[PDB]
Amino acid sequence: RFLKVKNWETEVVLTDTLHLKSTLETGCTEYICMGSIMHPSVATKDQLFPLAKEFIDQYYSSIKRFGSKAHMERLEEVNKEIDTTSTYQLKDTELIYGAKHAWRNASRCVGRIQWSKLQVFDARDCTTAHGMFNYICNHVKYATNKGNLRSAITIFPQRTDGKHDFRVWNSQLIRYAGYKQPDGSTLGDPANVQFTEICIQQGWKPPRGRFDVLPLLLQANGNDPELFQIPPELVLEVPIRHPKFEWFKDLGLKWYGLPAVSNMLLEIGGLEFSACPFSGWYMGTEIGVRDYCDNSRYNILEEVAKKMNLDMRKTSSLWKDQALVEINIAVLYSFQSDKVTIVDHHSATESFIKHMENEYRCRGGCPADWVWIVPPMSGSITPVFHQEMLNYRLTPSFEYQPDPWNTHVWKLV
Amino acid sequence: PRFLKVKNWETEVVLTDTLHLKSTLETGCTEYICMGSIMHPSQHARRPEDVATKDQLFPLAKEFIDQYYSSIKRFGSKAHMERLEEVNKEIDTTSTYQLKDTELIYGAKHAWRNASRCVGRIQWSKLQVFDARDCTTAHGMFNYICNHVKYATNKGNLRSAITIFPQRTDGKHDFRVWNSQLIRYAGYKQPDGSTLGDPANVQFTEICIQQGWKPPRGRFDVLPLLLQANGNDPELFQIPPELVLEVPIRHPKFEWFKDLGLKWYGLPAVSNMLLEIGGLEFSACPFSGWYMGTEIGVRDYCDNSRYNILEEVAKKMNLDMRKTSSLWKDQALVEINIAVLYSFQSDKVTIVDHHSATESFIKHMENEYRCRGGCPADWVWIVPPMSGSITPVFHQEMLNYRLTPSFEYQPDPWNTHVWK
Ligand code: HEM
Ligand code: HEM
Ligand SMILES: C[C@H](O)[C@H](O)[C@H]1CNc2nc(N)[nH]c(=O)c2N1
Ligand SMILES: C[C@H](O)[C@H](O)[C@H]1CNc2nc(N)[nH]c(=O)c2N1
Ligand SMILES: Cc1cc(N)nc(C#CCN2CC(F)(F)C2)c1
Ligand SMILES: Cc1cc(N)nc(C#CCN2CC(F)(F)C2)c1
Ligand SMILES: [Zn+2]
16 A cells, blocks of 8 residues: 655655554544544553553664564563563663654654754652752753753653652743743733642742743652653753834743653654653744743733834734734844744745655655644745645554543652 | 534533534444544445435435425424425436425525535525526526526625535436536646646646637636536537636735736636435535635645745745755745735735634534534545644634535546547
């Protein structure tokens, strides 16, 4: 079997064979498509054996040693550990490879042209929340690199019995607090009101401002999580100004330079790494469209349009559209002026298409989630909009997991 | 699966879908692969090839009649059981059957209602249906189409309509409108190698010239109709210009915008699709409504393989066009779409912006889950091609499935037509 995807802007046709090697479901059926569902859908010995064999087989194929003496010894060895300890340990090489291919297989990530330049930080010797904080500070300092951002991931010990998970309770390493006021308004980031509340309850003393970097809430070995303040000199931030509108800086807007997702699960050969924060650099629309202009977020369209004296009486004036562009210009100009790595949605989508074509050529395909790949503004004037894409799930993979406060059984009376 | 929920992530409203349990044919997807962004994911058709056998066409016919009579509070009534026996005899004798007026009107309205990719389906029950099943010649088809265009344009107050020509019989007697839309502009290959007018239509334009059309070779030459009746060679007709409502495109602040010399037509009238009812195939069924501004302002004007006017607009705007991060493309894009909306509204020609339209479709989804238990929607098509996440449908999960009656794509007739 083969499957073809077409680009309707260029008429290039690519041929996907890679999809024959997927195994978990997409959520779709033969008669319903669920491609716009945000979230559709511990292993025993018997379950873990084929998953591990699959990953060891593919690792040894990648390094052109399939069938080798070392491949067969490794399988034997992995299998002893699963027999003995009901789990196994990855070699460093396997860990690095698995982490890179989890990124390579992330169908919703438009930045995957960079997948093989991932700095893997092995933190599987960590045993405490203090330890995790140390590991995470070093990640932040390395990744941030004074504005010249570098891709990086820090991998904490894998799940065991489900009762000793390592977790970063934060959704990202750097995020701003949100506070709901008695009058119903919201200060800061409305997305983070719940996590802000858990922080305050755990003992965080909030300054209660618009851009309070939240504390880290770190859980090691199934214990209660603990609070740590990131050293402020490690949180690189960019004040948002506009190259034309002198008044823009008066909005008091700023954002952090480092996007670092910390709530996902890294799955490699059946092993579950439940704490594995990873970071790259921003595409501008993530800030200027979603973070700033989602109605459920900082929601600054009306403010910005006001200062543009746009006619906000009718929607067909496209005042929101006009204000959205200017905000996103300001984001890109601000990061660039401060020499903090950022990519605009045109460059990023163009690069993703080159990456996708190369992946079809060298690998037999590239799973891609159109719904997520297309930027949230100016969709059809980017090339990915006109690109057909096959979405399927390959492993190693990044996966969502339950928020830890919906699951954690608290220790301290 | 037993019942499927969709959630809106901006409002947290969750809807529960059972209508999908009536899905008939494959989406293209599997448990293991999703084809949500494939333009034509599936070739699963409900009847095969040409004249089907009775065991092939009757079950489809029986299904649609069953659905139609359920819709009107019968099922099992005298009329329902008589109609089955009637279609049964009719297929036994002619290898086809004919729809009652009521069944035709019901079927067209429900094809629109089931069109997962259509953002405008709040209007679905307000559809004027012109029965043209007595047509026999391309001259007849021209008469019917002209009336359609005139009724639907209605001096700018556009009305939704569909005109249904005779169904397919053996596949060698098809009625086809060879135009993809009733009204489009020509596209000319230039001697240097660029393109004048609309590049999408270069091939169809060449067929027209090859058929004897005399191109004015302008940027906005309305194309002739190329009408095929009862399988015969297609015939050219010029739509009377007084029936083709056009809007000159100007900007409410940029006075220089008018001098780009852009216009568009007022009536979007899709004419190359196939309407499928009870196993019957209406290969010629031009339908029309009114534009979402983005269709002209984003896709028609700004696609790289269409009119591609972004750099020329940006130039006039004095934008930094050195680097993509200046977002000059995005900035011109907004201004063009302001211009299109301003122009249509100034000339009292029906048009809807993408904000109003996506909001309407959220309301329509809610209605459909209330009364019907679901609403098939294609997120890739529903979300506007600009300012996606600031329209409410971006944040709305959708379930996509194929309900019948439907509109379907079909081969371009020149790929399949043996000339005479
Ligand atoms: C190097 C620069 C990178 C860029 C420009 C980039 C860009 C993006 C963007 C814009 C999104 C959508 C985010 C959203 O809409 O919320 C995304 C998603 C994602 N990225 Fe990347 N990314 C980068 C690096 C990485 C790295 C280093 C990893 C993992 C090692 C990664 C894994 C993912 C995953 C798993 C998703 C989707 C999350 C999900 O399934 O919900 N990305 N990326
Ligand atoms: C009344 C105003 C209407 C509006 C505002 C509207 C809006 C739209 C838009 C924006 C699209 C996507 C177009 C594209 O990107 O090419 C679309 C697709 C479609 N519309 Fe509607 N529409 C309207 C009326 C109708 C009517 C009357 C019918 C049929 C009787 C219809 C059937 C369809 C179908 C079948 C498609 C998708 C075809 C495909 O699958 O490619 N629409 N609509
Ligand atoms: C590849 C992709 O499916 C294709 O470009 C689609 C995307 N979404 C679309 N949405 C609409 N409304 N119209 C289109 O033509 C398309 N094209
Ligand atoms: C309902 C819909 O699936 C949801 O809003 C998705 C749409 N596409 C997206 N695409 C990206 N990159 N990020 C998102 O959060 C979303 N949200
Ligand atoms: C590594 C990375 C790079 C980037 N440029 N952006 C993101 C992001 C994000 C936040 N959302 C939540 C999610 F679903 F995980 C993606 C992550
Ligand atoms: C009735 C209608 C209304 C509208 N506002 N727009 C369209 C459209 C279109 C053009 N494309 C070709 C297609 F694929 F059929 C859709 C159709
Ligand atoms: Zn799907």
